[PDB]
Amino acid sequence: RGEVAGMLALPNSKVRIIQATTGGGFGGKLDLSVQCHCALLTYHTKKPVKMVR
Amino acid sequence: GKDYQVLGKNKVKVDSLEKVMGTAKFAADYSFPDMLYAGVFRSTVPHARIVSLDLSKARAIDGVEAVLDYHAIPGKNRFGIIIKDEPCLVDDKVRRYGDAIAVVAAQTPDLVQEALDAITIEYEELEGIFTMERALEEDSPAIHGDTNIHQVKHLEYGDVDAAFKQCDIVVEDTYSTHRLTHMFIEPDAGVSYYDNEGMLTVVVSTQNPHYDRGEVAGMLALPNSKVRIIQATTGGGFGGKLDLSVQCHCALLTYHTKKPVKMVRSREESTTVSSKRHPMTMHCKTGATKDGRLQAVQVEMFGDTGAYASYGPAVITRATVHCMGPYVVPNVRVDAKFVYTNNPMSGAFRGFGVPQASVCHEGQMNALAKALGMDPIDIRILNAHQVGAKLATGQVLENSVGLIETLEKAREKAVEVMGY
Amino acid sequence: MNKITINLNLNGEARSIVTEPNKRLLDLLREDFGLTSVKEGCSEGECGACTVIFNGDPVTTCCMLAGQADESTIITLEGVAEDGKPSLLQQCFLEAGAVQCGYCTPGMILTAKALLDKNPDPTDEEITVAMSGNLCRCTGYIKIHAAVRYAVERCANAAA
Amino acid sequence: MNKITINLNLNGEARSIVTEPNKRLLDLLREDFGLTSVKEGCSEGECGACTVIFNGDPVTTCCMLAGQADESTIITLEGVAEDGKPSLLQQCFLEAGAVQCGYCTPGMILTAKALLDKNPDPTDEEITVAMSGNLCRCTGYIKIHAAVRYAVERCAN
Amino acid sequence: MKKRGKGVGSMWYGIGNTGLPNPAAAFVEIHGDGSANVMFGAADIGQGSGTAMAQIAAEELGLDYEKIHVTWGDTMVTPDGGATSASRQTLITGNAVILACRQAKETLAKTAAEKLDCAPEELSFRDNTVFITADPERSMTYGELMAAMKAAGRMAVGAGSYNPNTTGLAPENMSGIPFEVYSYATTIAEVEVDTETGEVDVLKVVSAHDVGTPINRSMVEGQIEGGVTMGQGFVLMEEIEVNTKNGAIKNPSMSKYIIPSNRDVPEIHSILVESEGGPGPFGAKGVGEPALIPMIPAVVAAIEDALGTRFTHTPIMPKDIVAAVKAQEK
Amino acid sequence: IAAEELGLDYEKIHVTWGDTMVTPDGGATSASRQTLITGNAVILACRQAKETLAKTAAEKLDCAPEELSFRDNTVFITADPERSMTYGELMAAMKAAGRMAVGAGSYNPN
Amino acid sequence: MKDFEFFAPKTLEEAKGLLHQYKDVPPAIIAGGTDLVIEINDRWEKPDVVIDIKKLKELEYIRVEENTIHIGALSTFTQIENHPFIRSHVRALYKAASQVGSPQIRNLGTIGGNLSTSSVAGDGVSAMTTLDATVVLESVRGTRQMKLTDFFDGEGFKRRNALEADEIMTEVIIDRPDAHSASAFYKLAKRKSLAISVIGGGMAVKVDDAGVCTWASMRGGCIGRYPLHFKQAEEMLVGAPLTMETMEATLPILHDTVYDMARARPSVLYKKESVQGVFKKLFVDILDQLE
Numbered sequence A: 001r002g003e004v005a006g007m008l009a010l011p012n013s014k015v016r017i018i019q020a021t022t023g024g025g026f027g028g029k030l031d032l033s034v035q036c037h038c039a040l041l042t043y044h045t046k047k048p049v050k051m052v053r
Numbered sequence B: 001g002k003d004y005q006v007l008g009k010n011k012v013k014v015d016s017l018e019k020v021m022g023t024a025k026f027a028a029d030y031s032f033p034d035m036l037y038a039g040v041f042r043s044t045v046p047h048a049r050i051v052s053l054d055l056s057k058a059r060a061i062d063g064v065e066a067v068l069d070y071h072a073i074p075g076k077n078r079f080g081i082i083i084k085d086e087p088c089l090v091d092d093k094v095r096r097y098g099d100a101i102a103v104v105a106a107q108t109p110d111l112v113q114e115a116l117d118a119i120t121i122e123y124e125e126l127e128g129i130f131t132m133e134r135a136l137e138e139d140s141p142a143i144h145g146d147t148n149i150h151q152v153k154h155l156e157y158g159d160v161d162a163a164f165k166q167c168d169i170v171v172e173d174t175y176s177t178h179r180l181t182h183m184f185i186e187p188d189a190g191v192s193y194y195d196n197e198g199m200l201t202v203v204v205s206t207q208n209p210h211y212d213r214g215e216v217a218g219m220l221a222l223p224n225s226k227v228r229i230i231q232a233t234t235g236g237g238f239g240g241k242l243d244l245s246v247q248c249h250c251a252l253l254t255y256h257t258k259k260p261v262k263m264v265r266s267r268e269e270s271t272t273v274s275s276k277r278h279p280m281t282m283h284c285k286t287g288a289t290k291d292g293r294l295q296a297v298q299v300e301m302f303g304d305t306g307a308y309a310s311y312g313p314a315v316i317t318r319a320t321v322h323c324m325g326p327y328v329v330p331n332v333r334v335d336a337k338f339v340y341t342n343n344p345m346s347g348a349f350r351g352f353g354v355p356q357a358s359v360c361h362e363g364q365m366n367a368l369a370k371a372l373g374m375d376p377i378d379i380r381i382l383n384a385h386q387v388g389a390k391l392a393t394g395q396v397l398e399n400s401v402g403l404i405e406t407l408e409k410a411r412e413k414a415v416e417v418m419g420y
Numbered sequence C: 001m002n003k004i005t006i007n008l009n010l011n012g013e014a015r016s017i018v019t020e021p022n023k024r025l026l027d028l029l030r031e032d033f034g035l036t037s038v039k040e041g042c043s044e045g046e047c048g049a050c051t052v053i054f055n056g057d058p059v060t061t062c063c064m065l066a067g068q069a070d071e072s073t074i075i076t077l078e079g080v081a082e083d084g085k086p087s088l089l090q091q092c093f094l095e096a097g098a099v100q101c102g103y104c105t106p107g108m109i110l111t112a113k114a115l116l117d118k119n120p121d122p123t124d125e126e127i128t129v130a131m132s133g134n135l136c137r138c139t140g141y142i143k144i145h146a147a148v149r150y151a152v153e154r155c156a157n158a159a160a
Numbered sequence D: 001m002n003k004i005t006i007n008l009n010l011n012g013e014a015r016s017i018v019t020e021p022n023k024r025l026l027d028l029l030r031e032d033f034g035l036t037s038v039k040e041g042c043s044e045g046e047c048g049a050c051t052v053i054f055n056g057d058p059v060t061t062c063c064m065l066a067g068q069a070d071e072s073t074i075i076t077l078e079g080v081a082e083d084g085k086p087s088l089l090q091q092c093f094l095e096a097g098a099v100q101c102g103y104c105t106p107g108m109i110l111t112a113k114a115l116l117d118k119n120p121d122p123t124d125e126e127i128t129v130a131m132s133g134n135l136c137r138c139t140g141y142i143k144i145h146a147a148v149r150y151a152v153e154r155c156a157n
Numbered sequence E: 001m002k003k004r005g006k007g008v009g010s011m012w013y014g015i016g017n018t019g020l021p022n023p024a025a026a027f028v029e030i031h032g033d034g035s036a037n038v039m040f041g042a043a044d045i046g047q048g049s050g051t052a053m054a055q056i057a058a059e060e061l062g063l064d065y066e067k068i069h070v071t072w073g074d075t076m077v078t079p080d081g082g083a084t085s086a087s088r089q090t091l092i093t094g095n096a097v098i099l100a101c102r103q104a105k106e107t108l109a110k111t112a113a114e115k116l117d118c119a120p121e122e123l124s125f126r127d128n129t130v131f132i133t134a135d136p137e138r139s140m141t142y143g144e145l146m147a148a149m150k151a152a153g154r155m156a157v158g159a160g161s162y163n164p165n166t167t168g169l170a171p172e173n174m175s176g177i178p179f180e181v182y183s184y185a186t187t188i189a190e191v192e193v194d195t196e197t198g199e200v201d202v203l204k205v206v207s208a209h210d211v212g213t214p215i216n217r218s219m220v221e222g223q224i225e226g227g228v229t230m231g232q233g234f235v236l237m238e239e240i241e242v243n244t245k246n247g248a249i250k251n252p253s254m255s256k257y258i259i260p261s262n263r264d265v266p267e268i269h270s271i272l273v274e275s276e277g278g279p280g281p282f283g284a285k286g287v288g289e290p291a292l293i294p295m296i297p298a299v300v301a302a303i304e305d306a307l308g309t310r311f312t313h314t315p316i317m318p319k320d321i322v323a324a325v326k327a328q329e330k
Numbered sequence F: 001i002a003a004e005e006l007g008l009d010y011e012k013i014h015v016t017w018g019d020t021m022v023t024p025d026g027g028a029t030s031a032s033r034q035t036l037i038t039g040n041a042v043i044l045a046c047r048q049a050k051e052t053l054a055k056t057a058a059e060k061l062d063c064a065p066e067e068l069s070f071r072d073n074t075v076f077i078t079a080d081p082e083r084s085m086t087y088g089e090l091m092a093a094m095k096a097a098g099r100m101a102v103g104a105g106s107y108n109p110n
Numbered sequence G: 001m002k003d004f005e006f007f008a009p010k011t012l013e014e015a016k017g018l019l020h021q022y023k024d025v026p027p028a029i030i031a032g033g034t035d036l037v038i039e040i041n042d043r044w045e046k047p048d049v050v051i052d053i054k055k056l057k058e059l060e061y062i063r064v065e066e067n068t069i070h071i072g073a074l075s076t077f078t079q080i081e082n083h084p085f086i087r088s089h090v091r092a093l094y095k096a097a098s099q100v101g102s103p104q105i106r107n108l109g110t111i112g113g114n115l116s117t118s119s120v121a122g123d124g125v126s127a128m129t130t131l132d133a134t135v136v137l138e139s140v141r142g143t144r145q146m147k148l149t150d151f152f153d154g155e156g157f158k159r160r161n162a163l164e165a166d167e168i169m170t171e172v173i174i175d176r177p178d179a180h181s182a183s184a185f186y187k188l189a190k191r192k193s194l195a196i197s198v199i200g201g202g203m204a205v206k207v208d209d210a211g212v213c214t215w216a217s218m219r220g221g222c223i224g225r226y227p228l229h230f231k232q233a234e235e236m237l238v239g240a241p242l243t244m245e246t247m248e249a250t251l252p253i254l255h256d257t258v259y260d261m262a263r264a265r266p267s268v269l270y271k272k273e274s275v276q277g278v279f280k281k282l283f284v285d286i287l288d289q290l291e
């Protein structure tokens, strides 16, 4: 949340992160992955942006 | 007056953006995959037992998933905001026109209506009670229990019998108010479903989601933590959306079909089935001395609570506690009797009985002012409540009392804008 | 019953749909086009909550059959926003306190806009009559009317 | 490229759809039929997460072209539930602790079901090899196997 | 002919459920960047409770209104807020939010304290914990305070609940303490009655309401304007009719149950009156229902004044006006 | 943990997590910390909630010593030198007293 | 809603052809839909064939001639109230049109629809009756004209009026107000917008130089199945000058005929009184116009 809000210059309370059911992480999902890239695009297109690696 | 950082400021509402942009979703604006539509088969008679009910032909229509009566409820079948006298689906007997008897879930609104049209029923009609006079006659059938008397209150303060004898003026009149409907612009609507994680849920137009939850959980025999109620952006209530509307019928149809069930009421059904303001008749005798000071108030009132209690309890007591008006009256007596009738259900409507009470206490104050040739505002400032005044329930006002300021400011403004 | 083809300009774009004729325009907009901003408060033309701008005029979509939108230009609340942002009129409803429950709002905004697109500087009396087809149970109309008046003044204000 | 007509029996019902053939069976199920229980963990047939019962046999749907599902009988995890309730197998997976992150679970259950539908009383070894096509990074496979063994035993009665 | 008259109506209204427990709860969390979340069950049905709680939390926490996010009416993640009725939410849920914010402020105050001082310190106000208590100097920004909060492994979270202090009422005489606070109002209305057609036009209304202190002036005014209009309809237009044969309501539709249109509403001059000592948030009390009540008796009185007769029954329809007028003649 | 601390059935407990809008920050799920750190946060949140349950229950002769645990019922420090009380009777007394059981809690390794 | 075939002819000829083809169904014409769509939605009407005529822009017109005014059936009330001549010289129609429903209803609703519905409380109905309008009905069989009064009295495929199943009203005609003639309309109703008339009062007159009343029309919209014809009252005016006292002299007459002819109406006791307050206002209106 902090990172995304930072990227978009929005107060934390205005950015919602929902941790969906997660299929394992083991530490590999602590760093940012698609959060900022998706948000950045939704910010500019104002539409939902799905990113599946 | 206290330099607040943000308090008092005309800040744009946290929910106005969605409303002006058209993205805000009211219950009827929700749609889900595989969602079914629902309707209710309601009574067309006011008071009667059901001799027979045929749901077979409705069930046979291709496209109709379920047609249920009270037998489909796994938990309890008695609900109510205050008194549990309302069924989800009628079991023992119909008590009003529009009583919910059976529900239907189908693939389209047209199929639902088709299902309702195919249901047939036979009633054994009892006497429909529509007057409080007949309701009070003990030989009249009891809509609930053994009497049609729903609530009774008595407020006794000081001594009005002695007081009236010391008065220079006494005005006595019978007042009465009518039956009204909330008429919020958004008709009742809701949708229930099990979410991705199996959570039973109900998105609904309501004023009290937590209450709604307890009822649904009680119907489905589930713990409160396992029933989710989400209050959707609500298009007004004014008290008419406190009682259960579609929550249970939807949840029940979802419990059985396991699919999402959407129920949007036509304006007509919404009005026909939702609560109404209690019509009341108040007999009042108000006494005072020549200087216009109030000495005693005596009220004997009656209220028609309709087929079910709803806020009947809340209305009779609130009206009883305020019927002398916002004035210091050293002697007050109040008798109030609310009765059950087969008239539409009376419940909560902005004011909880005080609008009806004010018609009475203000009518009295104005007749006093006119007869004593006083200015209506002055006779009120004279008897107005102030910090320290003793209330008819024994309570003494300790703070936050600005009745005299409303009186003065109001008159000052009216002199200026309307020529008072 | 044979289906029909309805050609119209919806919220700025040319749309085309082949559908059953036995439905109201309200149903077409809400169900087939997903514009839930168009509300159904009464089903009989009284509340005005289902109002849309139709060929420049505010009309109650619950009183119309879907096929009647053929060859028409329609604007629903969704089509008022400017690049995902509140138009001036919309910003004014936000600030004037014209919004309580918000159910009559889509209709109020559309009716106001329909007027301003024809007459940029209406008299207060003209604003009232223009919006007399929209019922509100929360505001008492006072601030809704203020919002429109404020929009008219700020619009003129933009004389830079 | 012309759209093709596909007829199949999906989760107990006869379905039929006309669509472009340039896609995998996995895509068809996830996108066209909304069956998102069928996961895509590698895209190369290794993890098994995209396993579905294809004609009594489990298969990797990420290795099949949509058109190949024509005239077939397919069962995905959604088709296992009995009138909305967890089957015996599903119940065993629940109580055995065979579920951690749950991403591999759909495939596991489908492989175990395909097996049990042919061999009600399998050997622990037959169970192992039977599910060797599904990879899990959470459980170590221990408790998943236990759930299958668990189901078989309760199957006796 | 046309006759005008003016009438006054004053009212009293206890806030919260009558001599019964009826609490509400709330949750609060202040984020590391000086913004925050608030969770409360209280349903916002258009009156503005969600916005009120935000402004209250802002004032109490000393953060910007725009920095507060609010979630309500979801039984899965918001604590019971009781019913949104009895014009009780601003008072009960409002206080519940304040209490929630106070607990959360405990750590904030302790960390802020850690800079010479302790409790006595007016924390909160324009995004900064001011040492103020005798010296507004030695300030500290919320940005700086959260930095310290983090370095200390402290989080600003809180939970609160409130119940009005009341007593049950004795059944014999109804004695006791039903409400911990009451709202007051006085409305004066001017009308014009047509003696021959019975038409009643409401020209002007002045409505003054004692609200303790307003959380949002514009929202309070809307309540009043909506209430006055609902009152006008109560007396002159709205009336449900019942078929005593089958018990059905005869006029359930919008075309047959008449409520005021925008061309019916009169000139409305609202007056917000403040009173001190109130037990509510910053001394605020309810106005939701109070906004409607006084209008009703005022309109009635105004018609009596215009015609010179009494009307003790509502609604007062054209036929009732003509009957009264004809009854004054021969 | 919540069930043990509160003395309620695990099956009656519902939880929501990892949703920034309505769940408080629980730190990152790493360093095998969650059971420890969020586990204590929960207990502390439960205890605050128990403050009104205990106060309400205690209003039946006693105070701090009570033990709000085991099979849905608030017993007594010792056992029954003064009978126990069921959660059902407790919640009815909580309601009658106008009290709610809500709590917030946070923890940080020392 | 109920299934049905939907046609939208592009010319009057095609519409007539359709009406004729499906005349035995019978067909259900739809213009603005402000009456029909609701009748269908509430299931009061169950058509099998709907003929939308909104594309017939040719039926939307207001032609002011030397002695008559011809209004196309598809003319909306909005187009009617906005017409400068109507608004200036035919006050009865102006007031009625401007007070039908709301702007949304006025933007959709047509005079042909109003007259074809022939509602007891129809405001277009009341005004056009007061102005003694004539309607033109056409079909593949030709065309005919009839006084609105006879159109209402007659019974075609429906009892409400003389329309036949294959007919379409194409135009309404009223006499153009001469130098000294006047008309007035007053809508007695519960609210100032979206109100159903309780009494739709209409009055129109003609005078001859000397100021003598030559023609009189006084109608009580909503006080009868069709606007109540105050014949006796009109005859009292014809033959003498128009003054408040001469017009008020008819008041007891309006009272008596409302109570006689509206004998079975539910609110007769109130309307026999209020109809007097209504017409007094009409008297004022008429008089100020002539002066």
Ligand SMILES: Cc1cc2nc3c(=O)[nH]c(=O)nc-3n(C[C@H](O)[C@H](O)[C@H](O)COP(=O)(O)OP(=O)(O)OC[C@H]3O[C@@H](n4cnc5c(N)ncnc54)[C@H](O)[C@@H]3O)c2cc1C
Binding pocket: C044, C045, C046, C063, G028, G029, G030, G031, G032, G033, G034, G035, G036, G037, G038, G073, G074, G099, G100, G101, G102, G105, G108, G109, G110, G111, G112, G113, G114, G115, G116, G117, G119, G121, G122, G123, G124, G125, G163, G167, G168, G169, G170, G194, G195, G196, G197
């Ligand atoms: C909210 C609301 C408020 C209303 N307020 C008023 C009011 O205040 N005063 C009042 O007078 N009415 C009122 N109406 C009724 C309606 O607006 C009028 O009757 C209107 O003029 C009807 O025109 P329309 O084109 O909509 O007709 P439609 O509904 O299309 O049809 C009217 C009927 O006549 C037939 N018809 C239509 N056009 C023709 C034609 N040219 N030839 C032959 N037959 C035809 C149709 O088949 C149908 O049976 C109200 C309606 C609504 C929904």
Ligand SMILES: Nc1ccn([C@@H]2O[C@H](COP(=O)(O)OP(=O)(O)OC[C@H]3Oc4nc5nc(N)nc(O)c5nc4C(S)=C3S)[C@@H](O)[C@H]2O)c(=O)n1
Binding pocket: B236, B237, B238, B239, B349, B350, B351, C100, C101, C138, E045, E046, E047, E048, E049, E050, E051, E052, E084, E085, E086, E087, E088, E089, E090, E091, E211, E212, E213, E214, E215, E216, E217, E219, E220, E223, E284, E285, E286, E287, E288, E289
């Ligand atoms: N000191 C105060 C008091 C009130 N307010 C404003 O007025 C509202 C009403 O507050 P309050 O009197 O505390 O009442 P509630 O929040 O409990 O609201 C319920 C109340 O609200 C009323 N007004 C309504 N307004 C709308 N738009 N919709 C309803 O359904 C309404 N229903 C009615 C009825 S009935 C009731 S019981 C607050 O949200 C606030 O925006 C304020 O700013 N400052």
Ligand SMILES: Nc1ccn([C@@H]2O[C@H](COP(=O)(O)OP(=O)(O)OC[C@H]3Oc4nc5nc(N)nc(O)c5nc4C(S)=C3S)[C@@H](O)[C@H]2O)c(=O)n1
Binding pocket: A024, A025, A026, A027, D100, D101, D138, F029, F030, F031, F032, F033, F034, F035, F036
């Ligand atoms: N006294 C204890 C300790 C642990 N547990 C169980 O074991 C789990 C681990 O708890 P804990 O050690 O507190 O660790 P976290 O909950 O903080 O989990 C994170 C940790 O979890 C690990 N195991 C994983 N397991 C799964 N399924 N998926 C990952 O991504 C995993 N990633 C790793 C890595 S790396 C880390 S840092 C708990 O949820 C619990 O079910 C328990 O019952 N009692």
Ligand SMILES: O=C(O)c1cccnc1
Binding pocket: B082, B313, B314, B318, B352, E016, E017, E018, E020, E085, E086
């Ligand atoms: O809900 C109640 O019981 C209630 C609400 C308001 C006033 N008195 C009682």
Ligand SMILES: O=C(O)c1cccnc1
Binding pocket: B197, F014, F015, F016, F017
């Ligand atoms: O199943 C649950 O209890 C659950 C699932 C997702 C997020 N929170 C809770």
Ligand code: FES
Binding pocket: C039, C040, C041, C042, C043, C044, C045, C046, C047, C048, C049, C050, C051, C060, C061, C062, C063
């Ligand atoms: S739903 Fe169309 S006007 Fe009310």
Ligand code: FES
Binding pocket: B185, B235, B236, C098, C099, C100, C101, C102, C103, C104, C105, C135, C136, C137, C138, C139, E046
């Ligand atoms: S703001 Fe609620 S109906 Fe208008």
Ligand code: FES
Binding pocket: D039, D040, D041, D042, D043, D044, D045, D046, D047, D048, D049, D050, D051, D060, D061, D062, D063
């Ligand atoms: S995605 Fe098919 S096996 Fe991995």
Ligand code: FES
Binding pocket: A023, A024, D098, D099, D100, D101, D102, D103, D104, D105, D135, D136, D137, D138, D139
């Ligand atoms: S449980 Fe996580 S991969 Fe199998």
Ligand SMILES: [Ca+2]
Binding pocket: A029, A030, A031, A032, A033
């Ligand atoms: Ca991450």
Ligand SMILES: [Mg+2]
Binding pocket: B206, B207, B208, B209, B212, B241, B242, B243, B244, B245
């Ligand atoms: Mg409710």
Ligand SMILES: [Mg+2]
Binding pocket: B304, B305, B306, B307, B308, B309, B310, B311, B312, B345, B346, B347
């Ligand atoms: Mg009742």
Ligand SMILES: [Se]
Binding pocket: B238, B239, B240, B348, B349, B350, B351, B352, E085, E086
């Ligand atoms: Se209410």
